[PDB]
Structure 1
């Protein structure tokens, strides 16, 4: 019941693993949700259209009193079995969704929304120590994969992310005409985006077992996250101070485990747990510290419940990313089309029941 929290859940349908968690996460990225509603999907085929199918899911999350279905969404991007989810990381799903919607926004009043919210800039470098040669590769990024093994918290992971590696000994850099050279290799952050998607590296290759295994190591992350020290050049008008928005959690050892997401949708520290169709109020401690993962001095049970993805929002952007969404933000054109789709699927049902009964 939406009456407990003001928020509605998503149906437990098929085997879509992390999908519901990511959908709630994107739905509460209000600036994104607004842009999604603006997509000119009138000409679209509802079986094939990811943009239309995401409009439908966001609309129903905003308006429906009952849990929201995702079958037409999964059909539209073609991940209709468990295997589809097992062959992709959560960030890959996010990119499928965000790339589809950004493409549909091309040449509209919301063109550029996806990069505006999610894209940062980095540069990857290799610097020769004995000779005058440097290779610089500038890249956009939409998410960051953070190493956790042997790291206590987010801060130690970021230190390790920008750590300078020595390319020496047998590991010298092929510097072309300069020959093999001792060098140093690193990554620098130039910008950090308004909405910062961090995946934790919990699904690690293991030689012994020979495939990926989930690691349950305790790894701590804060409500407030200062990142100025990880930028090449800071901005005194806009420090890289981040506020925790969402914690995506998994329990178990495999894709038949259980996926939930914790959010404080307003960015005000008031958290809810979203567990498919049940959305419930929760403590901040339930959202945050309880998802750090079990203490290694506790042999009571297997501690297989922990965070794998965090969404942080930049403090200076918070009021704009989380801008309020009203009925006026949904075009009547789209409202009518979604009602039309509802009638059409209300009849596809009855014709299926006629031919099967």
Structure 2
């Protein structure tokens, strides 16, 4: 613990979970809200809220590597298969929807959407008939296409690019028949905490297989996103600071997962390799994970205007006495 930070017990079958837990743990405002959840009546093994409270508590207090057994147990993913068949954002939705449900009716209701939810609009516009379809969506995460793209900017460019629906890919416009159309996405808001997964896998139609992309893909320390909003705010530009880089090395049937974090948002990074946390260069965290067998697959950015609120200090006093008492008894039960 000479970095000041403690690790989690060896990933084993749990894959990218440890990576995500450190990422969520250092989303300080989330952690604080998780501690405020009223778990007093919950079961010590089947409540996900309580097991996440306990992991966060141990990450904050333990000098030894922290275990996740009760947490994996609590949501029912106890096999290499359960982790392998899902992606990291699905695990994140599992944890965060469990937590946001428990916060309903409390002083911390709305924490999850406050931090992580943004708003987009999808459209289809017919060019030759007066028909348009609009769909407003919430999103908690973005999946960016990387194949052929050099950087995050070009992925965003591609994400909001307008597609023509013509030829064989005519839009079915109902009573208007098959119609030539455009479709696009536009962002209306970007969240305080921006979760970007990079599409390191895709089905490719020419080869007829799901392909891994191991190409170089560059991501900045500072990400300006005003270009991609439908209306920018001059009082609050969408400027983003890189907080976390989740990385995989090696085999597509196992391999190894690590996360690089700069917890305070200050450009001083550590590598979290399960039980070993170590100081690292910025270059190790960022450039050396660009690729092109060691691939970044998830980036977390925090908005500059929200940085001090999201990464507010947490002290031991910020954990409710009820919960400390519970978790201390639940540690005495372990001896």
TM-score, with structure 2 as normaliser = 0.98
Unaligned 5+ runs, structure 2: none
| Contact 1:247/1:262 (8 A) holds in 2 | yes
| Over 6 Å off, 4+ runs | none
Displacement of 1:341 after TM fit?
1.1
Output one character per residue of 1:291-345: Cα deviation in whole Å (capped at 9) or x when no partner.
Answer: 0002xxxxxxxxx102000000000000000000011110111011011111223
155-164 or 204-213: bigger deviation: 204-213
Deviation at residue 221 of structure 1 after TM alignment: 0.3
Q: What residue is the counterpart of 2:227 in the other structure?
A: 229
In structure 2, how many angstroms separate the alpha carbons of the residues matched to 1:67 and 1:110? Answer: 29
Q: Distance in 1 between matches of 2:321 and 2:11?
A: 29
Change beyond 3 A, Cα 1:137–1:112: same
In structure 2, the CA distance between the partners of 1:13 and 1:289, relative to structure 1 (3 Å rule), is: closer
Against the structure 1 CA distance between its residues 79 and 209, is the aligned structure 2 distance closer, same or farther, given a 3 Å change threshold? Answer: farther
Q: 1:206 deviation in Å?
A: 4.6
Closer, same or farther: CA 209–337 of 1 in aligned 2, 3 Å: farther
Tell me, yes or no, if the aligned pair for 2:240 and 2:303 is still in contact at 8 Å: yes
**C-alpha distance 210-48 of structure 1, shift in aligned 2 (>3 A):** farther
CA offset digits 1:235-275 (Å, max 9, x no partner): 00000000000000000131410100000000000000000
* Native 8 Å contact 2:11 2:274 kept in 1: no
Candidates 30, 34, 37, aligned match of 1:36: 34
Contact kept? 1:13, 1:70, Cα under 8 Å: no
Does the aligned pair in 1 maintain the 2:124–2:183 contact within 8 Å?
yes
Aligned to 1:217, the other structure's residue is in SS state coil
1:312 aligns with 2:301: yes
Structure 1 position 210, deviation (Å): 5.8
Q: CA deviation at 1:207?
A: 5.8
Q: How does 1:162-311 map to 2 (within 5 A)?
A: 162-206=160-204, 211-294=209-292, 304-311=293-300
Any idea what the Cα deviations from partners look like across 1:92-147, whole Å, max 9, x if unmatched? Answer: 00000000000000000000000000000001000010111110011100000000
On the 8 A contact 1:243/1:314 being kept in 2, the answer is: yes
1:215 Cα deviation from its structure 2 partner: 1.7
Q: Does the 8 Å contact 1:17/1:255 carry over to 2?
A: no
Task: Please provide the CA RMSD for this pair.
Answer: 1.1
Q: Are the structure 2 counterparts of residues 208 and 12 from structure 1 closer, same or farther at C-alpha, using a change threshold of 3 Å? A: farther
Normalised to the residue count of structure 1, the TM-score between the two structures is 0.92
Q: Would you say the 8 A contact 1:14–1:81 is kept in 2?
A: no
1:152-198 CA-to-partner distances (Å, cap 9, x unmatched) read 00000000000000001121111111111110000000000000000
C-alpha contact (below 8 Å) 1:31/1:321 kept by paired residues: yes
Equivalent residue number for residue 134 of structure 2: 136
1:291/1:99 Cα in 2 relative to 1: closer, same or farther (>3 Å)? same
Number of equivalent positions: 335
Gaps of 5+ in 1: 295-303, 347-357
Cα distance in 2 for partners of 1:115, 1:35 equals 12
